[PDB]
Design a protein around this ligand. Structure first.
Ligand SMILES: [Mg+2]
Ligand SMILES: [Mg+2]
Ligand SMILES: [Mg+2]
Ligand SMILES: [Mg+2]
Ligand SMILES: [Mg+2]
Ligand SMILES: [Mg+2]
Lengths: 50, 120, 241
RNA sequence: GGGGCUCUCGCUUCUGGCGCCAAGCGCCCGGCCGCGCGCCGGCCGGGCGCGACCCGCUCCGGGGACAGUGCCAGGUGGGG
RNA sequence: GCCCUCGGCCGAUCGAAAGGGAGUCGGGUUCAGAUCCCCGAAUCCGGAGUGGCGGAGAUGGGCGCCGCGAGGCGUCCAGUG
């Protein structure tokens, strides 16, 4: 509410604890549910990657 | 070769906490229970409705201390009248006095208990 | 031999995004309490800043061998405790009633403690050796002592541990002690100590007085400079032929 | 053969799975039965290390003697 | 009692008789009270340490024997439906 951009709810794995982390990214246009996004230095150049 | 901090947070270590061992009691003696049995039960109710409770519902109606709860009323009636009671209903009157409807056990008759009390 | 085939290795992989990281040591990255961070940053500041020679002179202390010999000598003239003094007083009282009131045993030589006591001994030139702790809480209590001691010609050393000096004087901490007088049999031991002290503290006082401390950068900064100078060294290597 | 030498001093991208509380190895310490010759046979337990490299002085990064703050000086200031 | 290991609602506390929030209904009864009293049918939550009773788990196969058979005994192997 109050924001024109849709938000994306993305779930990662915590690398140090057995747990799931939920982020609230700003949705880039074209991304869909059930899609894999990759965040990091070695991430490839695709829509939605960070 | 075994001191390893596997967490990046420092927490306050748990130190010994001793129980109090006072060198003198702060009060010389424990003050006595003011809400004893004779304080709990003040006087029975002898009104028209109270009389109807005795004959019909096997219930003795009392005016009790406003601080006493149902457990204290139950034990107080049992001790100073030597009767068994089933349940205690309790309201507070508009004038501020607490009123207790003390139903007696089936083998106790509220009529002759009120007779030996002296409120018949 | 009788090895169970059911037994097998389960080698887990700690690559990025693979199996969860093990519980390894994280002391290097702990959020320490404020008092721990404060006393660690204080140590780093004493390395960053240019420490004046009056304060930096106390970072030069006696080595392990010489400090051990010095405290070995000082243990013999350790001051009497309360129970030792009370026993001596009781013995004097019982002796006096029987037939005494004299024989003060010359007040046998003892170690004089305290900065106020020691500085008056140095001014009167009645001190033969002065031992100063290197870690006085306000350094103002001692920064005048090395310069005063040489001005009066009294040999002075800096030892590590104000708690070590305190342990001699049966207290938690002593700022400085002094050998005023020594027994005849220990005169040779004191002379060997004093000569070793003079060559290291009194004789090179002009170097001590002009020796600034600190002014050392951190290992990360030093490494950045080192790889820059190494890169420029290769640049000059190609510059020449 | 292979060192000064450059990236690597890496282990995860076609799937809307799963993933922690160590396997393995080495070194020991208790108790049991016993070859009753000790590294000695086996059985119940407990511990440490490598697995998971070493060292170090700022947690990591970005600014930085500027910004900022305190005091004075000049300007502007119907916002009051 | 102490030691090892594990433990971020990461923030006290207050804030709704219309929000969220387990589980009570029928009949009778008073001058004035009743889903609260009486009668009769339920139901929720909590407790049960020495364990209240049942039922489940869980009670089957193989081999050696006795026994006309039925059925019994010994050994071994299973069995968190
Ligand atoms: Mg009530
Ligand atoms: Mg005006
Ligand atoms: Mg917390
Ligand atoms: Mg509240
Ligand atoms: Mg409500
Ligand atoms: Mg009404």
């Amino acid at each position: 509410p109050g924001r024109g951009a849709p938000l994306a709810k993305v779930v990662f794995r915590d690398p140090y604890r057995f747990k799931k982390r939920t982020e609230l990214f700003i949705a880039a246009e074209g991304i869909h549910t059930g899609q894999f996004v990759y965040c990091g230095k070695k991430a490839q150049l695709n829509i939605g990657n960070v | 070769k075994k001191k390893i901090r596997t967490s990046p947070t420092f927490r306050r270590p748990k130190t010994l906490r001793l129980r109090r061992q006072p060198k003198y009691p702060r009060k010389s003696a424990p003050r006595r229970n003011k809400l004893d049995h004779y304080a709990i039960i003040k006087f029975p109710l002898t009104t028209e409705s109270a009389m109807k409770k005795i004959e019909d519902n096997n219930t003795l109606v009392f005016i009790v201390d406003v601080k006493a709860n149902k457990h204290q009323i139950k034990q107080a009636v049992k001790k100073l009248y030597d009767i068994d009671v089933a349940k205690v209903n309790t309201l507070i009157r508009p004038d501020g006095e607490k009123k207790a409807y003390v139903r007696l056990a089936p083998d106790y008759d509220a009529l002759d208990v009120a007779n030996k009390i002296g409120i018949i | 031999k009788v090895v169970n085939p059911l037994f097998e290795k389960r080698p887990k992989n700690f690559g990025i995004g693979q199996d969860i990281q093990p519980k390894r040591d994280l002391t290097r990255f702990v959020k320490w309490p404020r008092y721990i961070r404060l006393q660690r940053q204080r140590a780093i500041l004493y390395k960053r800043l240019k420490v004046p020679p009056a304060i930096n002179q106390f970072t030069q202390a006696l080595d392990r061998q010489t400090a051990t010999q010095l405290l070995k000598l000082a243990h013999k003239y350790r001051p009497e405790t309360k129970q030792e003094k009370k026993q001596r007083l009781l013995a004097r009282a019982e002796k006096k009633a029987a037939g005494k009131g004299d024989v003060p045993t010359k007040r046998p030589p003892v170690l004089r403690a305290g900065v106020n006591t020691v500085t008056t001994l140095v001014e009167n030139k009645k001190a033969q050796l002065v031992v100063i702790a290197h870690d006085v809480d306000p350094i103002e209590l001692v920064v005048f002592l090395p310069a005063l001691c040489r001005k009066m010609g009294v040999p002075y050393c800096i030892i590590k541990g104000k708690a070590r000096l305190g342990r001699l004087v049966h207290r938690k901490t002593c700022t400085t002690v002094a050998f005023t007088q020594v027994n005849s049999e220990d005169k040779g031991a004191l002379a060997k100590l004093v000569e070793a002290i003079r060559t290291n503290y009194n004789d090179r006082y002009d170097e001590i007085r002009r020796h600034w401390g600190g002014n050392v950068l951190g290992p990360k900064s030093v490494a950045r400079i080192a790889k820059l100078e190494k890169a420029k060294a290769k640049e000059l290597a190609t510059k020449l032929g």
